[PDB]
Amino acid sequence: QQINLEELMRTGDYAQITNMLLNNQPVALVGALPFVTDSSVISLIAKLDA
Amino acid sequence: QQFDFRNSMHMLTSNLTFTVYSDLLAFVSADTVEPINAVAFDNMRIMNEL
């Protein structure tokens, strides 16, 4: 699924996201975003990204 | 009146351990969108002459 971030921080977030995050459900996000590069594989196995 | 123990001895029904709260509300966390983004029953946008 999806959820425009632009409209999010505008609308004020209706815990829609808050709920999905809490409950763990496959989802996507959209808009401008800060990436962050890592290396030491480790990080991955440890699944830091979650 | 004479005194008769028996009849003056009553048992006591009392709840146990409260905690009384006043003011209330306070527990409410609330913010606000940025003024430039308002809306009435309208839903189009209050104050919209850019």
CSV table of C-alpha atoms in Angstrom, one decimal:
chain,number,residue,atom,x,y,z
A,1,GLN,CA,0.0,0.0,0.0
A,2,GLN,CA,1.0,3.6,0.3
A,3,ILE,CA,0.7,6.9,2.2
A,4,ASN,CA,1.8,10.3,0.9
A,5,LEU,CA,4.2,11.7,3.5
A,6,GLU,CA,3.6,15.2,2.2
A,7,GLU,CA,-0.1,14.9,2.9
A,8,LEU,CA,0.8,13.2,6.2
A,9,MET,CA,2.8,15.9,7.9
A,10,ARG,CA,0.1,18.2,6.5
A,11,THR,CA,-3.0,16.3,7.6
A,12,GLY,CA,-1.5,15.6,11.0
A,13,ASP,CA,-1.3,11.8,10.9
A,14,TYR,CA,-4.4,9.9,12.0
A,15,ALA,CA,-2.6,7.1,13.8
A,16,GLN,CA,-3.3,5.3,10.6
A,17,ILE,CA,0.5,5.0,10.3
A,18,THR,CA,0.8,4.8,14.0
A,19,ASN,CA,-1.5,1.7,14.0
A,20,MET,CA,0.1,-0.1,11.1
A,21,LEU,CA,3.5,0.4,12.6
A,22,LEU,CA,2.4,-0.9,16.0
A,23,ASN,CA,0.6,-3.9,14.4
A,24,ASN,CA,3.3,-4.7,11.8
A,25,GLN,CA,1.8,-4.8,8.3
A,26,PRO,CA,3.5,-4.6,4.9
A,27,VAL,CA,3.6,-1.0,3.8
A,28,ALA,CA,5.3,1.8,1.8
A,29,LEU,CA,6.1,5.5,2.2
A,30,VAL,CA,6.5,8.3,-0.4
A,31,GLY,CA,8.3,11.5,-1.0
A,32,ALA,CA,11.6,13.3,-0.4
A,33,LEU,CA,13.9,11.3,1.8
A,34,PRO,CA,17.4,11.1,3.5
A,35,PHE,CA,19.2,8.0,2.6
A,36,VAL,CA,22.0,6.5,4.8
A,37,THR,CA,24.7,4.1,3.6
A,38,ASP,CA,26.2,1.3,5.7
A,39,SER,CA,28.8,-1.4,5.2
A,40,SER,CA,29.8,-4.0,7.7
A,41,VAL,CA,27.4,-6.7,6.5
A,42,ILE,CA,26.9,-7.5,10.2
A,43,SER,CA,24.5,-4.6,10.4
A,44,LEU,CA,22.2,-6.4,8.0
A,45,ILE,CA,22.1,-9.8,9.7
A,46,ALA,CA,21.4,-7.9,12.8
A,47,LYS,CA,18.6,-6.5,10.8
A,48,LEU,CA,19.3,-2.9,12.0
A,49,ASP,CA,16.9,-1.5,9.3
A,50,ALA,CA,13.8,-2.5,11.4
B,1,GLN,CA,-30.9,4.5,76.4
B,2,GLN,CA,-29.3,1.4,77.9
B,3,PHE,CA,-26.3,0.1,76.1
B,4,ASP,CA,-26.4,-3.1,74.2
B,5,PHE,CA,-23.2,-4.1,72.5
B,6,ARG,CA,-24.5,-6.7,70.0
B,7,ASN,CA,-26.8,-4.3,68.3
B,8,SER,CA,-24.3,-1.5,68.2
B,9,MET,CA,-21.6,-3.6,66.5
B,10,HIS,CA,-21.9,-3.2,62.8
B,11,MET,CA,-19.7,-4.5,60.0
B,12,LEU,CA,-18.2,-2.2,57.4
B,13,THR,CA,-18.4,-2.2,53.7
B,14,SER,CA,-15.7,0.1,52.4
B,15,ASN,CA,-13.9,0.0,49.0
B,16,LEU,CA,-10.1,0.0,49.1
B,17,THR,CA,-7.5,2.3,47.6
B,18,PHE,CA,-8.4,5.0,45.1
B,19,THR,CA,-6.8,7.7,43.9
B,20,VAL,CA,-9.0,10.7,43.1
B,21,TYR,CA,-8.4,12.9,40.1
B,22,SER,CA,-9.5,16.5,39.4
B,23,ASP,CA,-8.9,18.8,36.5
B,24,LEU,CA,-8.9,15.8,34.2
B,25,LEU,CA,-8.3,17.1,30.7
B,26,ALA,CA,-4.6,17.5,31.3
B,27,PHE,CA,-4.0,13.9,30.3
B,28,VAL,CA,-4.8,15.2,26.8
B,29,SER,CA,-1.9,15.5,24.4
B,30,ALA,CA,-2.8,17.9,21.6
B,31,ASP,CA,-1.0,19.9,19.0
B,32,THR,CA,-2.0,22.0,16.0
B,33,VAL,CA,-1.5,22.1,12.3
B,34,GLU,CA,0.1,25.3,11.0
B,35,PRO,CA,-2.5,28.1,10.7
B,36,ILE,CA,-2.0,28.4,6.9
B,37,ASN,CA,-3.9,25.1,6.7
B,38,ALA,CA,-7.4,25.5,8.2
B,39,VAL,CA,-10.8,24.2,7.2
B,40,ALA,CA,-14.4,24.6,8.3
B,41,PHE,CA,-17.4,22.3,7.6
B,42,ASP,CA,-16.4,23.4,4.1
B,43,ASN,CA,-13.3,21.2,4.0
B,44,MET,CA,-11.9,23.2,1.1
B,45,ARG,CA,-9.8,25.6,3.4
B,46,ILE,CA,-10.7,28.5,5.7
B,47,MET,CA,-8.7,31.5,4.8
B,48,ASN,CA,-7.7,30.6,1.2
B,49,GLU,CA,-6.7,33.8,-0.6
B,50,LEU,CA,-3.1,32.8,-0.9
